[PDB]
Curated annotation (Swiss-Prot), chain A:
Keywords: Cytoplasm, Glycosyltransferase, Purine salvage, Transferase. It is found in: Cytoplasm. Signal peptide: none annotated. GO terms for molecular function: adenine phosphoribosyltransferase activity; magnesium ion binding; protein homodimerization activity. Homodimer. It comes from Escherichia coli (strain K12). This is Adenine phosphoribosyltransferase. Catalyzes a salvage reaction resulting in the formation of AMP, that is energically less costly than de novo synthesis. It catalyses: AMP + diphosphate = 5-phospho-alpha-D-ribose 1-diphosphate + adenine. It comes from the Bacteria. GO terms for cellular component: cytosol. Belongs to the purine/pyrimidine phosphoribosyltransferase family. It is an enzyme of class 2 (transferase).
């Protein structure tokens, strides 16, 4: 389990922006962690350590900030990376899941051939808020016969209840940086 | 210090081609089959990192979204910060913007103004070099912030679309792993 020093370094690497993207939200900006070679390397090293003995066979990350954390974790575990994408971007056969945006609905897609029965999948994302894109991604993985019990995040907004919501869907969340607020 | 024939052939054979995606008459070169093969993905990142490990790169810039899948592991391999360039309204801090042509009309790429400073030596990474319009726009962003950029790296080079020569005219040397013909 990560040391207190390591977890505090990561928390202090993330910039917060008052009243973005609207009034009353203190936005947690993971791009300041990406620009610090120490913070970014540590985040990936800590996620690789958590799952190295977990029998993961694929990492799935959602477009686009999910790519930044899922793909290095895949490389660190030595397993394939599978992108979940906005519609119309994947060129081979896909399945789709509909989920809620703040101002409407949208879809996520995955290649049908990218997950099979026998796969044990880790989902990786930058930040856990309501958890809606993760729940949609888990449905894509399970519809292809993949087993997914694990989701990893750089940031957890614990006041938004996403860890408990994902636990009701059989997903255990590992998060490096907890922050309060909406 | 040089890619073997066995390595370059493995990478080329790891990429699937899809006729008439996304519009009739394009043979789409799909890097997602390279991502799903841990051997191919790991190799591709090793080769890009090896080309720049002595070039004094201080930042890697990756274009949203497939660019992130190569630029960010290259940043980690070189032990330097990663800077995303994004479609508008995604980056939360102060940005500047550059316009580039799509097939029809135009779109914008943004960068955080604090991400690049005078003295930075930047590598741009993307999955695939086609016309190179996003890379020309990204180079303009970097130089407006006082960054030095002379290098772009790619997995795929569509050599029939002339992107390498266009980027050479802006002072950019391209490194690519997998050449394919066609548009
Ligand atoms: N405070 C916050 N920071 C980043 N993303 C968020 N999504 C919802 N609330 C957020
Ligand atoms: N054949 C191709 N495959 C992928 N992306 C492209 N962009 C332009 N032509 C392309
Ligand atoms: Cl995103
Ligand atoms: Cl479907
Ligand atoms: Cl279902
Ligand atoms: Cl993309
Ligand atoms: Cl061909
Ligand atoms: Na309000
Ligand atoms: Na803005």
């Amino acid at each position: 389990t990560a040391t207190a020093q390591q977890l505090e370094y990561l928390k202090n690497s993330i910039k917060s922006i008052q009243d973005y993207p609207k009034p009353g939200i203190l936005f947690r900006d993971v791009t300041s962690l990406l620009e610090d070679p120490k913070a970014y390397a540590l985040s990936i090293d800590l996620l690789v350590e958590r799952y190295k003995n977990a029998g993961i066979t694929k990492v799935v990350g959602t477009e686009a900030r999910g790519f930044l954390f899922g793909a290095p974790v895949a490389l660190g575990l030595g397993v394939g990376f599978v992108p979940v994408r906005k519609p119309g971007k994947l060129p081979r056969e896909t399945i789709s899941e509909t989920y809620d945006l703040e101002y409407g609905t949208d879809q996520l897609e995955i290649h049908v051939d990218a997950i099979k029965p026998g796969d044990k999948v880790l989902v990786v994302d930058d930040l856990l808020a309501t958890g809606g894109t993760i729940e949609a991604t888990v449905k894509l993985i399970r519809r292809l016969g993949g087993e997914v019990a694990d989701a990893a995040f750089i940031i957890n907004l614990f006041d938004l209840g996403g860890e408990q919501r994902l636990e009701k869907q059989g997903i255990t969340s590992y998060s490096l940086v907890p922050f309060p607020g909406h």
